[PDB]
Amino acid sequence: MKTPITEAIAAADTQGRFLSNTELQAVDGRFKRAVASMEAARALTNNAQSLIDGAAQAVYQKFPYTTTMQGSQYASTPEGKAKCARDIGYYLRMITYCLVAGGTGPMDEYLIAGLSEINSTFDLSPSWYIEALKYIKANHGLTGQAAVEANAYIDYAINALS
């Protein structure tokens, strides 16, 4: 899994070398940035339910047809709505993992790999999730470097969907 630490180790192991000061500085950067990351992770976790509930509705408002059109890919039934809220919770949970891990590894491994194939096979529109992520970015209520941290991964998800 991609983290500042595993990247440090992989780079050293590829050259069959012992870790150097070059690698250890990187890790220190990771430990120091942790304060703001853990701050963003906890906050998103505490307000998870409301961010998810608010994010789901923002999508239904932006794309009104997702609630009326017939088809299992739509949130026009109780199941569809449950699937949609579940997916959005998946995105949010992934972002707290990235914050906690200090890298995109969790999101890359559990969500982004195979993302295009899934949205294509099940006819799920990327613009739906992008709107959910934009809602979370605008309403997480974080400031300073904690916001910079959260936004970094939110935008990473958005770009992966673009």
């Binding site: 899994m1 983290t3 630490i5 595993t6 440090a8 180790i9 992989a10 050293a12 192991d13 069959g16 070398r17 012992f18 870790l19 150097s20 000061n21 250890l24 890790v27 220190d28 430990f31 942790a34 304060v35 853990m38 992770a41 906890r42 976790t45 998870a48 949970r93 707290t96 993992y97 906690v100 891990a101 200090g102 590894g105 969790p106 559990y110």
Partner: protein, 172 residues
């Protein structure tokens, strides 16, 4: 591989849950202990050559049959191979110290090593003795009170010993 952080994340994902307060608190502490961890890695790494060399000399002085004609460490090619292995094991142990998790050690180093030594005819128990000697040298260097900000950095020393014992058991 996994560091101590990705370890918790992977456990949470398997259960499909956000992290709990206890987990966040545990992770913050690892971060607060990061300075000590980096000091131990830097100190062991800085003395890599002497640790390996001194352990090799000690091993061969106790087990002279390893360098006698026929011995598994006889001839420069085999001697070089043996020194390389000691350095390699020490290398992967420092990786595990930095990661705070032993997966990188097991995965890219220990796994399948015992089988490798048996196929070659290399005495695993003698390798284990070499590993043990490096352990005592690495720990005495990492936990040396001179030239560093005073403080309890002993829990980390037990973690470090754990990795060495882990490697010693995989070849023994």
């Amino acid at each position: 591989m996994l560091d101590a952080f990705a370890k918790v994340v992977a456990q949470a994902d398997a259960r499909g849950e956000f992290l709990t307060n206890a987990q966040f608190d545990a992770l913050s502490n690892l971060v607060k202990e990061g300075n000590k961890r980096l000091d131990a890695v830097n100190r062991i790494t800085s003395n890599a050559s002497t640790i390996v060399a001194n352990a090799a000399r000690a091993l061969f002085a106790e087990q002279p049959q390893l360098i006698q004609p026929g011995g598994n460490a006889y001839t420069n090619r085999r001697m070089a191979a043996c020194l390389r292995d000691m350095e390699i094991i020490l290398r992967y142990v420092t990786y595990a110290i930095l990661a705070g998790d032993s997966s990188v050690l097991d995965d890219r180093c220990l796994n399948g090593l015992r089988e490798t030594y048996q196929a070659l005819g290399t005495p695993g128990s003698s390798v284990a003795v070499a590993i043990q000697k490096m352990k005592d040298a690495a720990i005495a260097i990492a936990n040396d009170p001179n030239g560093i900000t005073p403080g309890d950095c002993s829990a980390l020393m037990s973690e470090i010993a754990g990795y060495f014992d882990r490697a010693a058991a995989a070849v023994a």
